[PDB]
């Protein structure tokens, strides 16, 4: 049967005070399997299920550094969207990203996902073709023009058709 992997990432700026709280949660077949929380005593990705303890320290170190980079990305882009929506600084805002893959019995990519939401509203989403973008409003059209010119869709497609499927199968084997 089919299988799926998804990551949901959120960053929340509270009252503009300090660093956004960043969280990332991964799911395989609708089961949470890893998780990162910036508010933890020492922020690292942690296994949420016993079959993930099969991965060595290098795996954890690596994906933790990916989380570290993502924190910065979310910081910068929260600021950018404050700009696009002409909102005053000092407020509370959330930026979310969901991405991942569905694969068939065949073990091949059935559908990829890469999509972003701001303050609980759709912002920009990669279409099923993994080539074109749905922009939810006029602000998101700015990003879409930039992303069409930068080949962002190809960038995400490289992960969705490569790493995403491979890792999903590795985790299905681990489980």
């Amino acid at each position: 049967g089919p299988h799926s992997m998804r990551y949901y990432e959120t960053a929340t700026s509270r009252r503009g005070l300090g660093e956004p709280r960043y969280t990332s949660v991964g799911y395989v077949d609708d089961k949470e399997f890893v998780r990162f929380d910036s508010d933890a005593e020492n922020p690292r990705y942690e296994p949420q299920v016993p079959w993930m303890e099969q991965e060595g320290p290098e795996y954890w170190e690596r994906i933790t550094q990916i989380a570290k980079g993502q924190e910065q990305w979310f910081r910068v882009n929260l600021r950018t969207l404050l700009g696009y929506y002409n909102q005053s600084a000092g407020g509370t805002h959330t930026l979310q990203r969901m991405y991942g893959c569905d694969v068939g019995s065949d073990g091949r990519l059935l559908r990829g996902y890469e999509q972003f939401a701001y303050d609980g509203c759709d912002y920009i989403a990669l279409n099923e073709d993994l080539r074109t973008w749905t922009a939810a409003d006029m602000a998101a059209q700015i990003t879409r023009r930039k992303w069409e010119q930068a080949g962002a869709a190809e960038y995400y497609r490289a992960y969705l058709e490569g790493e995403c499927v491979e890792w999903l199968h590795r985790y299905l084997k681990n489980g």
């Binding site: 990432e9 795996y59 994906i63 990305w73 882009n77 950018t80 969207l81 990003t143 930039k146």
Partner: peptide, 9 residues
């Protein structure tokens, strides 16, 4: 394994 968003809004 998670991925980078990379591209700026």
């Amino acid at each position: 394994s998670p991925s980078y968003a990379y591209h700026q809004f």
